[PDB]
Amino acid sequence: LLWVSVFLYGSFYYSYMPTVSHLSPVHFHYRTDCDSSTASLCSFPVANVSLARVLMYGQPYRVTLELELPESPVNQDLGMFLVTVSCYTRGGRIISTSSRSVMLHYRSQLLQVLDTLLFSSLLLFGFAEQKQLLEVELYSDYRENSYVPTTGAIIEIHSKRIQMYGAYLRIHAHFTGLRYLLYNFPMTCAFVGVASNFTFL
């Protein structure tokens, strides 16, 4: 009856995750006037993103920038780099300026080799990828100003060598306690729910 257990876990996830949230894609555009003799850009990656509502008043939300990096040798030697977010008004005025410093998680060369060996099947079939997801937490608790709503955000990374695939500006209501495991640790939720439902069945 593991089929019924899987269906019950799926229904559990669907019911307890009606996430009222928005995932704005971030498109970094560069400058390209240099000689390009080295693997370094010209100017810092910048991006205007428009949210056009979700950012209403009273409810708190957590503004983050989920950032997808490759575990390339250029990224491990890059080191610390600064991420800046500037929410803007309708007329261009800045609402709230933030700043964070984010850096790639360090794993030893032997650890990388062992990861490549053991997770080889998922990497070969395209399920897994040798990438890092950094959740730059731009705002631990956001509350919108009543008079001037947030039209969008300008996001900047102050690194001329930061190899990356893409970026998301996820905004989600701060309600976490009931969904904390599902909001942060999905695989454990799947394991626990499937086991509990199978034992019940």
Binding site: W3, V6, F7, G10, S11, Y13, Y14, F127
Partner: peptide, 21 residues
Amino acid sequence: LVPLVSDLTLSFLVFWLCLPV
């Protein structure tokens, strides 16, 4: 593109076709 983002609803029925099939 992750393999389980918007297909959970499909997985609630495509997998459910295991019953008539």
